[PDB]
């Protein structure tokens, strides 16, 4: 009987300075799945379809959005929707978190997100 092991490794990208678009915020490696791109869904509290939202911690509620993409460019669902369906590579798949920008226009400081990665095996 095969176990369903799911693993995720997150690697930080370059420091961000005030923002440039298409900035590589960080890289994700999803592993262990037996599985297509629409079987993976990255969700967060903002729940903005196609984007993860990062919010400042200073009480000022500054925010910027990011997209999650891999490689031909592909994408898992983010908050229930694809941005840019394929079979994921064997063993593991790299996804890149890339800055879009801020619809509200950003103080320097610390920004956060809590992201759930849902993998529907098979």
């Amino acid at each position: 009987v095969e176990p369903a092991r799911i693993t995720l490794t997150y690697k930080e990208g370059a420091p961000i300075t005030i923002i440039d678009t298409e900035l590589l915020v960080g890289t994700l490696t999803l592993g262990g799945y037996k599985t297509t791109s629409t079987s993976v869904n990255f969700t967060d509290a903002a729940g903005d379809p196609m984007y993860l939202t990062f919010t400042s911690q200073d009480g000022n509620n500054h925010q910027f959005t990011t997209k999650v993409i891999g490689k031909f460019d592909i994408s898992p669902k983010v908050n229930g929707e694809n941005l840019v369906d394929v079979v994921l590579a064997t063993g593991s798949q790299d996804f890149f978190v890339r800055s879009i920008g801020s619809k509200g226009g950003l103080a320097a400081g610390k920004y956060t997100d809590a992201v759930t990665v849902t993998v529907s095996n098979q």
Binding site: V1, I6, L8, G26, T112, D113, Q122
Partner: protein, 186 residues
């Protein structure tokens, strides 16, 4: 770099209809404790415990306890490991596997009927599953690759076409392994 992980002892559960329950192991493969939050989703079932602390490297058991009788039903068991310009992101893996509710009235197993998928192209590559089982395709190619999906029992499923007409597929057997390759001309 930061690593996350949630392991479920099986990649699918075959739940005999009306059975008292089944047990399944879950392991926190991360080096920090998490809360393990378990939920069952539609495509009536109790998961005990639905939330509990699982320390670093520790494994515990979940109990899953309970529909048409002429065919399988599909549910999803999701097991999530929750942590109980500078960018700080935290992740939580939500590991979901198929909960296949299987009536005892049913003769055989999916592998007995994997060959019986019939195919046609309209609009979309359409599969037809006349068996009372979910045909959980794990590999599918047409005209030499299609993102697969299960075919529901006594039903059809339409895949987007990606003039060659071969279709080759493998289902995933009850044990989580890839079954034999079947091939038909469409």
């Amino acid at each position: 770099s930061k690593e996350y992980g949630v392991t479920i002892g099986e990649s699918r559960i075959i739940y005999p209809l009306d059975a008292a329950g089944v047990m399944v192991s879950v392991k926190n493969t991360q080096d920090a404790p998490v809360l393990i939050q378990s939920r069952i989703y539609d495509e009536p079932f109790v998961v005990t415990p639905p939330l509990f602390r699982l320390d670093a490297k520790q494994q515990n058991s979940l109990r899953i306890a309970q529909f048409p009788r002429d065919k399988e039903s599909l549910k999803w068991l999701c097991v999530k490991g929750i942590p109980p310009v500078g960018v700080f992101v935290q992740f939580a893996i939500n590991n979901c596997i198929k909960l296949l509710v299987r009536p005892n009235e049913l003769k055989g197993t999916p592998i007995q009927f994997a060959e019986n998928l019939s195919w046609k192209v309209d609009g979309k590559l359409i599969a037809e599953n006349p068996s009372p089982f979910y045909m959980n395709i794990g590999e599918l190619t047409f005209g030499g690759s299609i993102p697969s999906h299960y075919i529901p029992p006594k039903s059809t499923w339409a895949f987007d076409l990606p003039g060659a007409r071969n279709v080759s597929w493998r289902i995933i057997n009850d044990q989580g392994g890839l079954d034999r390759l079947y091939s038909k001309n469409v």
